[PDB]
Design an enzyme around this catalytic site. Sequence first.
Site, PDB file in Angstrom:
ATOM      1  N   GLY A 263      67.745   6.339 -24.250  1.00  0.00           N
ATOM      2  CA  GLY A 263      67.162   5.037 -24.021  1.00  0.00           C
ATOM      3  C   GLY A 263      68.136   3.883 -24.112  1.00  0.00           C
TER       4      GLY A 263
ATOM      5  CB  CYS B 210      71.544   4.403 -20.255  1.00  0.00           C
ATOM      6  SG  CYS B 210      72.128   6.050 -20.748  1.00  0.00           S
TER       7      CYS B 210
ATOM      8  CG  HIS C 144      71.762   7.519 -15.256  1.00  0.00           C
ATOM      9  ND1 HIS C 144      70.725   7.198 -16.107  1.00  0.00           N
ATOM     10  CD2 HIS C 144      72.898   7.360 -15.976  1.00  0.00           C
ATOM     11  CE1 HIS C 144      71.217   6.818 -17.274  1.00  0.00           C
ATOM     12  NE2 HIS C 144      72.534   6.904 -17.219  1.00  0.00           N
TER      13      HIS C 144
END
EC number: 3.4.19.12
Lengths: 306, 306
Positions: free
Chosen positions: A143, A145, A41
């Site tokens: 932030g 991920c 993503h």
Amino acid sequence: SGFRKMAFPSGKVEGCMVQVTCGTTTLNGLWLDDVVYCPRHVICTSEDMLNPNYEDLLIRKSNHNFLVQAGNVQLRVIGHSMQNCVLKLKVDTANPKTPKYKFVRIQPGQTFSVLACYNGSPSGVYQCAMRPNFTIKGSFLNGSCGSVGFNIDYDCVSFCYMHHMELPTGVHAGTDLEGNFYGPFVDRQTAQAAGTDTTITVNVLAWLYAAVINGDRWFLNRFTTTLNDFNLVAMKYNYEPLTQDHVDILGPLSAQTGIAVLDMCASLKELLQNGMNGRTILGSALLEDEFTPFDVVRQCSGVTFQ
Amino acid sequence: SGFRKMAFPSGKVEGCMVQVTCGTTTLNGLWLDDVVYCPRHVICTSEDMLNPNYEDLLIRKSNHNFLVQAGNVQLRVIGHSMQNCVLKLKVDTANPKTPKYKFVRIQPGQTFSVLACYNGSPSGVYQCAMRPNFTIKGSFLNGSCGSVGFNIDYDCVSFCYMHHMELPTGVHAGTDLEGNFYGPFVDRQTAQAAGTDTTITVNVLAWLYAAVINGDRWFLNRFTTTLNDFNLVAMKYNYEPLTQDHVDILGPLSAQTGIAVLDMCASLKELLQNGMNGRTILGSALLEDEFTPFDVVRQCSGVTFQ
Ligand SMILES: CC(C)[C@H](C(=O)Nc1ccc(C(=O)NO)cc1)c1ccccc1
Ligand SMILES: CC(C)[C@H](C(=O)Nc1ccc(C(=O)NO)cc1)c1ccccc1
């Protein structure tokens, strides 16, 4: 003596963390040999996340759209591919700090360390458990991920988790390093709710052994029980059923302390039915279930990693 | 979201840990530039520890009696001296992995990360607080002496603790890196007992702000209080008195949440007088006091270290 929630030393993983930017989205990646792993993503906008068609969104991306930065130094992307829910970015330089590593898919109830990162930079390290409902209870902001979870055995890092999502209820979901989510979760901003957060019975018992080893013994009683009898109580309190496999795994702790597993089960039963009465065990007023039997043995014996 | 007991990334300190052997005793040392720091009781036998005369015991030691090993590679000792309760071993090679660092003596109530080591090898990392009675509640076995505690700001490691002793009660005592013990403790196997373990009030309040930020708000009430009124309750429950300095330090968290400090004090007062009634706050059934206001801000904002 003393028993603490303890994470693995994080240096080996620190040297693998990079920053990955695609358009306006920046998150973290894991650089091992000449491949950088990150959540797919990264290619989405916040709008895209409601109903993303990842295959179609990726058609518009080329190697040079993935900006990969290791500290202050830029890496050159020479290929990219999607595997399940992760992207694999092939770079022209092998990470010189690559440790000996494996990718592992852990089972619910197993524990691991998380290196929380932002913009490719480590922020902190803490210990987690894969819950029976396949969430983890982490500490993740926007932030984070691409932060990863891992165990270490001697000199080999076993990567088991990559962070992808926060559910509206505040718990966290992610994948193994092959990109397959733990549990039923998907990388779509939708109504997906976690199931029952059941307690990891074998881990609670291990922690009670750790308490006895370290001098906390007020909860030991004169009783015993059977697996079937204990499990009637476990079910009432949303505890996972105890199996003979679990009993065997607790064998070493049983032998060290001289307390039979079913005797400790009877102590746990009384604690569930009567509570703590305002007392504590190893500094906690709750029954802790994110220490595995192997965690307890390791900490109580002081094994190290080179 | 999510709030966890989080240690600093440990890689910078991992590269400074060495093994120090003197005779039959092996513990850990800290290698910074061309000096290795370690507890002076490395020169003692188990018999010596009852009544050691360190000055006299050191007369019998020469440079070549201190065996210092960094991983698999031996360091050459070219001088040695005692500073308070630590030994400084001058080696002929500067640690190439020396980070930017400072030595700091912390105040009671401040927190730090511990890298637990054995035989010079890292075993795990966890977060600690210097208690008001100048003990810490760590996880240390035989061989862990010389393990250090630290904070990191950007790229600078502030070393604040070196582990020396376990008290018969299971808590831990040690020195700063100048070799001065925190509190009244000495490196002698004697009757030394810890005083009252009072709770760090300002840290509890910070953690309650962290709870509100992360969605746990059931404990907020319709009441307020005064410093003097709150402190009458603090005293009853062995809480440290709250000062205007503490109120000011909580200012930023107060501003972010819109909850005045004295209003949160009234919430804490009710929690102390009535207990948790079987509920939890950030996964705990106890009032947690090993998060500082700066810890909470840091974790809730995701600051990193390069
Ligand atoms: C899991 C939870 C339900 C359990 C517990 O609180 N039992 C409890 C049972 C009865 C009473 C009572 O007052 N009976 O009259 C009070 C408390 C428990 C046990 C250990 C640690 C945390 C929580
Ligand atoms: C510090 C401790 C003393 C305090 C506490 O337990 N208070 C308490 C007071 C009254 C009763 C009662 O039953 N009155 O009738 C029961 C419990 C507390 C508060 C929050 C978290 C942990 C502990």
